[PDB]
């Protein structure tokens, strides 16, 4: 009955942890029912976002710590009011669909997953400025 539906959630959750190779941890503090319903329409193509209770995810994560292991250290991020955005797109393009659009006075990206990695979405906000002047400012340390 209620074991019924919860287990159905473990199902469609486990399925996204496998299929999609990437993941965002977004925070929807406040954020209307109308805001969310329109980040769907914006990301309908590639990404798909899934929501739920904290205590349902800390378990389901560990519920399969067997296979798919590096979702393990996703747990010290699945606290507060969090949400999941699974995708198979590049970095930058997705985050700005989220971080920006349908914001009023929007939701926030707090951590990103890509094959056992934990991006702060702050080392993702790169502009080839400290990355081009490191393939060159060290070339003056070579010339």
């Amino acid at each position: 009955g209620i074991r019924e539906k919860k287990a159905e959630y473990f199902a469609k959750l486990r399925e996204y942890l496998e299929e999609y190779k990437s993941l965002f941890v977004v925070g929807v503090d406040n954020v209307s029912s109308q805001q969310m319903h329109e980040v769907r329409k914006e990301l309908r193509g590639r990404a798909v976002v899934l929501m739920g209770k904290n205590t349902m995810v800390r378990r389901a994560i560990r519920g399969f710590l067997s296979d798919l292991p590096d979702f393990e250290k996703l747990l010290p991020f699945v606290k507060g009011n969090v949400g999941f955005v699974f995708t198979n797109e590049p970095l930058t393009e997705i985050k700005n669909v989220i971080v920006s659009n349908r914001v009023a006075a929007g939701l926030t990206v707090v951590q990103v997953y890509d094959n056992g990695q934990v991006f702060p979405s702050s080392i993702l906000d790169i502009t080839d400025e400290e990355l081009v002047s490191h393939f060159v400012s060290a070339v003056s340390t070579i010339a």
Binding site: G116, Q117, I123, I126, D128, L131, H134
Partner: protein
């Protein structure tokens, strides 16, 4: 810098700069970055 030390030792060694490239280096110099500080180099300095 942390994500600009071995990445610069990659921006002055080997040849190109693939994801499977620096990962056989930082995980070989007995001192890697953070694995995510590495995959970033396969994004912010492309081509």
């Amino acid at each position: 810098m942390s994500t600009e030390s071995a990445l610069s030792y990659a921006a002055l060694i080997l040849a190109d700069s693939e994801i499977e490239i620096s990962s056989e280096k930082l995980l070989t110099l007995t001192n890697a970055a953070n694995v995510p500080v590495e995959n970033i180099w396969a994004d912010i300095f492309a081509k």
